[PDB]
Amino acid sequence: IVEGSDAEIGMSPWQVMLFRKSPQELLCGASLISDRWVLTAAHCLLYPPWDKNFTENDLLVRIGKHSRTRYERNIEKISMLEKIYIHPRYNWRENLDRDIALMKLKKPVAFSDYIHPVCLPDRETAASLLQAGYKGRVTGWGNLKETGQPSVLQVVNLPIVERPVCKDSTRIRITDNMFCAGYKPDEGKRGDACEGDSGGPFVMKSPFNNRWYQMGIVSWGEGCDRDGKYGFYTHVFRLKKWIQKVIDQF
């Protein structure tokens, strides 16, 4: 996260770290959506242009973390994966359309002050909150600058951007399964996700029921925190029928 700040303890208790077993390293963020299901970006698990195609046994998820690098004894919980589910129409060939994946844990994780699921939006909460200018919150342990790494989880609040502005900022084809967020050059304030944040959550706190909802998944950006560029996020609500289908079936 660029131009963010240190998270408070327990501020993002749904935050998950996707961790490579060997070599031991941060791969991506992710989020806890129930005691057995973790949501992330498909490209965190499958990206053939980079020879990336992880299997379950390659990975762990670390839940309840605050420190990036520390083993947080008596606080974090480390879970093995039972099964990865990639959206069947995830477009790794072109533009990361439908950049979403689920991971089922081998065992349920125990909730605590540090570990708690985020809500997924209903149609109405999505319609109400996914509006240009409305801010969400992005969290992660990714790099602090494009060109370094945080001691603890970082947080930044960023406004959703008008779709024409998103589209006009890039040559990539933007789909309805994406939204973008970030400040404009003239807005003064700054901030973005960066390398290692992808797969983590973009959340909004509903003013109707005072619950946190995951509206986006950190998907892609051209650079980090560049003027005139914006971060792109998977539109979780648009893909929620797939999420529900996977959870209902498996």
Binding site: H116, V118, K205, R211
Partner: peptide
Amino acid sequence: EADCGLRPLFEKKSLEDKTERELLESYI
């Protein structure tokens, strides 16, 4: 989950984090 999105150290205790108000103020 019925209890989703309510943080033990914040909403469950009626404590506000340092920047959530920034989000609320944007929901105009």
